[PDB]
Symmetry: D2
Subunit: 256 residues, 4 copies
């Protein structure tokens, strides 16, 4: 339900959300997997509607601590959706070309067009996250970006983009296990890079940056949802539920 | 299977391929779906390898007569593939922006990067198909493009791109039936009036497809003629050809350079 | 002389600016040409500094009624500037690709990078100008865009873009002569577009739209300048003066730092 | 005018071109400057036709040894050209995003459109130059690229692009002065890199790559011109002459009006 939408009152505190919380689903993994299968099928039908109607633009932003489940959320929640109408835009270390323009330039280029659903795998929020945590620009610079982001998203929404932002929220010990497993798994070693450790040493700074970002930019037109993500089955189910409910609210119809 | 690969001998004749041929699968519809499901899961694992290895580029080109099943092929063959590694680039009627540059400009911009598999829903070949059939440029112009394409694809492959080109081959009457289907129903939005103009030109299109295939099917960028009158056979055959191709790359997960605290 | 900078008090009135005003220059065309040549030489040197320092981004927006002199301003004001560091981005009728995204998508793509000076030949302001005058989207939509533009420009400025916006202001009788000239000159007829006459019939609505846009979006970090433009020599001189002074105000420095055998 | 167009016979030899050659212009520095001014103004006027006609695409390639004068040529040759029709595309060290595609991806994106003149400040040729000299890919890789480039440029020309490729040819001792003068000038030190020295130490391997590239890719649809570039006034004059005449050969026309009538 909507106990996970962050209200636009600037009173948000990340400690009020428990990464192991599963209270929204009355059951465990096995029943959730079945309910996910039902939601996934509705998602597929709604996506085909979105694409066919060709009017709405849908933007899903995914942010998380490292190993917080971004890849799994993309892979599982959107399984079976027509590839012609869903696109993943990943944002990594900015290139020199990208740093030569404002930080929103490379992000604005990737926004979804009419009839399209786009997933931001990481996003412009990295410019008030990692950029803040590692002081890649002075605080006086990034402090102003919360306003930039609110106004950029307001413009997107005003012009027809439905915006969903999900913070996949895992605990510190959960990250330790996933990072270790990533080491203890030959098919996952490629995902692990030593830089992952340095980011972990800053666990508390990142959590502070995430709370500030979420408090500052969760709006009626661009809400943040905090997703307890220690349980993959719960994470996938809750994201699917919110996404499906949002898409249903658009009242999309096939053209005559 | 390889009897469906157009050899680079310039002696391709499209009549030597039956739109209803299914001789490559020993069974019927139901047995094929079982093998297709097996191939699909094979496809998924190979995509995750491709993405993880981050070395090869894979370009799948889809061409067919209208209603020849390209949209269905994309939706069925790549069901369940991780969206982060599979991308569809569709090419429609060129804009003024795209016509102000060479015809390959808009196509080159969309090629797959390392670790990525890209589906061309239509391709640069439209510039030696519809462009030729409707004489949108003089033959003196487009007849040169067979070489451009051979060389453009040669450069892509030399630099690491695996190229598969599939012609989904249906019969004319089969087309009529499917077109009539499009009018009857949730799909009416897909139907176009220009489609009829193209239908009367069925023969000029078949000739262009044979010419393009004869001219541009190469060792580094082969054409496969896919009997596509049967969707279950079409999907199975394309899946089989692709999976073999990905298997031939012998891809391996990379390697690393210890206890997390 | 910042008598032409529109202050950010939302009080701007277009009627208080006379297109024939030349009061800022004590002289006429011949003396202005000499002052322009002096300013142009400084501009060329400041541009080389901008490029060499590689930190600031400079955006010059040009808007005007049709035949209001934007092409002439570009040609004359930027005569002799190194092509490696200045670039014109012109905005015409949005394509379907561009209309499928928010109106700022196609504009953001063209903003200047570090060390570069970009001229917007027309700009995002068309989306509260022609779009407003001809109701290309409902008033409920475009009325919201003044805020979008204020915040878009604020973000650009916060992140290092110096923004100058020039409204080249000609009178209605002046536009009649210049349009009539474009018809009577074989070297300019191609510039004449039949839509221009429709736009002329709406002269008053465009003036209203320009007044609203300028009142709504002239801010400290992104000022509008109203340029009396009936006199080309005065227009070119005044734009050069404002541009040069702005660039001088940035106080740009060449970057910091053995024999060759 | 005729003697600087590398013939498409694959026997091109660089040592048969003198960086100090000025034999194409009858005069000295001052007489060339006057002719350069005359060519410059025709260039301005021809560009306005190109832009207005909106049919032809014009691509000017500039390659040179470091400090060989590519920046100066752009600054001088195109001084006074309307920015609305002339665009410079610079190519530096590829980003990871650009390396994830074939080396021609980032270059093809920048080709000129109809009515436009584009200057490639460095180009796709760097992928058989610095890439070859420093073995950024195995010779097995970059050896195939001469073919790629001939065919890429053939496609461009067939589809309406006029291609001019200029190698600005300076001597090893001449480069030494410009690099030195680059240090001895507070307004130019920013241009000097230490990598400039490591590339200078490889002068001969670079010269060999240029001869190979020029011999392999000079064709009748995409000619290379070797420009004696030790003297700036001659370099600027010669490049201007070749460019202007080529533009004259296009026989560009102002369009016909839309459709005598009166304005109210
Ligand atoms: N604006 C930014 N400034 C600096 N670093 C950034 C920015 N945006 C993204 N990054 C960083 O880019 C890094 C790598 O992203 P990339 O997708 O290229 O690699 P990856 O191995 O797939 O990582 P992941 O799956 O965690 O995104 C991340 O650590 C992220 O913090
Ligand atoms: N280079 C080209 N020049 C002219 N027409 C082209 C070109 N490329 C594709 N086309 C034509 O444009 C149409 C494809 O446009 P688009 O992708 O918008 O179609 P659609 O309505 O989605 O359906 P479909 O693509 O399946 O036919 C086809 O009729 C094709 O022949
Ligand atoms: N956002 C927009 N919405 C609608 N029309 C627009 C928009 N932006 C620009 N235009 C229109 O585009 C036209 C300019 O087109 P373009 O620049 O391609 O041609 P042009 O002949 O050079 O015209 P001009 O010299 O007046 O700019 C103008 O009529 C202008 O009103
Ligand atoms: N394909 C390529 N592979 C490797 N290096 C390349 C490639 N293309 C260009 N470069 C190199 O990029 C370097 C930097 O050029 P850049 O345009 O970024 O800036 P610059 O300092 O102004 O250089 P310059 O004035 O010498 O052109 C040059 O040394 C050039 O050789």
């Amino acid at each position: 339900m909507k106990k996970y939408r962050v209200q636009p009152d600037g009173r948000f505190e990340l400690k009020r959300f428990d990464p192991d919380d599963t209270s929204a689903f009355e059951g465990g993994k096995q029943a959730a997997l079945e309910a996910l299968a039902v939601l996934n099928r509705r998602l597929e039908k709604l996506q085909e509607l979105l694409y066919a109607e060709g009017q709405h633009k849908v933007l899903v932003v995914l942010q998380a601590m490292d190993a917080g489940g971004k890849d799994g959320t993309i892979r599982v929640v959107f399984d079976g959706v027509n590839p012609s109408g869903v696109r993943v835009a990943s944002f990594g270390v900015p290139t020199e070309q990208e740093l030569a323009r404002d930080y929103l330039w490379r992000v604005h280029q990737q926004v979804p067009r009419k009839g399209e659903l786009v997933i931001f795998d990481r996003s412009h929020y990295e410019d008030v996250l990692v950029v803040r945590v590692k002081n890649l620009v002075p605080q006086q610079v990034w402090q102003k970006r919360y306003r930039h982001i609110r106004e950029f998203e307001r413009m997107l929404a005003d012009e027809g983009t439905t915006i969903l932002k999900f913070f996949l929220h895992i605990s510190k010990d959960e990250q330790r296990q996933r990072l270790q497993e990533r080491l203890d798994n030959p098919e996952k070693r490629w995902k692990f890079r030593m830089g992952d450790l340095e980011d972990r040493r800053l666990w508390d700074r990142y959590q502070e940056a995430y709370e500030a970002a979420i408090r500052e930019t969760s709006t009626e037109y661009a809400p943040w949802y905090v997703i307890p993500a220690n349980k993959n089955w719960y994470r996938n189910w809750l994201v699917s539920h919110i996404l499906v409910e949002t898409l249903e609210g658009l009242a999309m119809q096939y053209p005559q």
